[PDB]
Amino acid sequence: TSEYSINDPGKADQTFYVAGFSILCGAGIFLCLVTSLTVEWMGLTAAKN
């Protein structure tokens, strides 16, 4: 939403929007899951330790 002014909204912007922000959301989900899982394993092993 940098240059999305009234003059040039675009006809390919929506496709383009998915290409940007869609990727970010997917990545965020992946990172979040990875982080929770990592810690869980660490804790279990520490207890085991």
Experimental method: cryo-EM
- Whether residue 39 contacts residue 45, with contact meaning beta carbons closer than 8 Å, is answered with no
Burial per residue of 6-35, b for 16 or more beta-carbon CB atoms within 10 angstroms, e otherwise:
eeeeeeeeeeeeeeeeeeeeeeeeeeeeee
Quick one: CA torsion of 24, 28, 29, 33, rounded to 10 degrees? Answer: 160
Tokens of residue 41, six digits = 């394993």
Quick one: CA torsion of 14, 20, 25, 28, rounded to 10 degrees? Answer: 180
- Whether residue 44 contacts residue 35, with contact meaning beta carbons closer than 8 Å, is answered with no
DSSP labels, 16-36: HHIIIIIHHHHHHHHHHHHHH
Distance CA 5, CA 2 (A): 8
CA nearest 16: which of 6, 2, 29, 30? 2
